[PDB]
Amino acid sequence: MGKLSEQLKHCNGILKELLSKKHAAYAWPFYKPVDASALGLHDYHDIIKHPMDLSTVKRKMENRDYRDAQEFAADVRLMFSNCYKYNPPDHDVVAMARKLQDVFEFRYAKMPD
């Protein structure tokens, strides 16, 4: 297969891992779009202009929306950045984001050339 295909297989592997039971204890806040209204976060969409979550990343991967690994990584990192922008840095969800980003960055680094 081509490099872009092989790199997107690596990306799909990472996505499956981020959604796996292994990481569920800290990944679960990132599974679905933030329901701002339901959670009482009435300022969320004033602060976060581009919401992102792992179900949206999964839909985009399934729809062949991602043309390369860089585009995939941009959405996963946008998801983490939204968490660091919105939440005070001492909040539990930020610790969970940092742990899941550690999983992401270390495996993303193993991208086949």
Ligand X SMILES: CCC(=O)c1c[nH]c(C(=O)NC)c1
Residues that bind ligand X (CB under 6 A): 29-30, 34, 39, 41, 83, 86-87, 93
Could you say which DSSP state residue 29 is in? G
Q: How far apart are CA 88 and CA 28, in angstroms?
A: 19
Task: Report the residue number, 26 or 111, with the smaller CB distance to ligand X.
Answer: 26
Is the distance from CB of 23 to CB of 29 less than 8 angstroms? no
Kindly state the smallest distance separating residue 106's Cβ from ligand X, in Å.
Answer: 21
Is the distance from CB of 99 to CB of 24 less than 8 angstroms? no
Kindly state the smallest distance separating residue 45's Cβ from ligand X, in Å.
Answer: 12
Task: Report the residue number, 68 or 92, with the smaller CB distance to ligand X.
Answer: 92
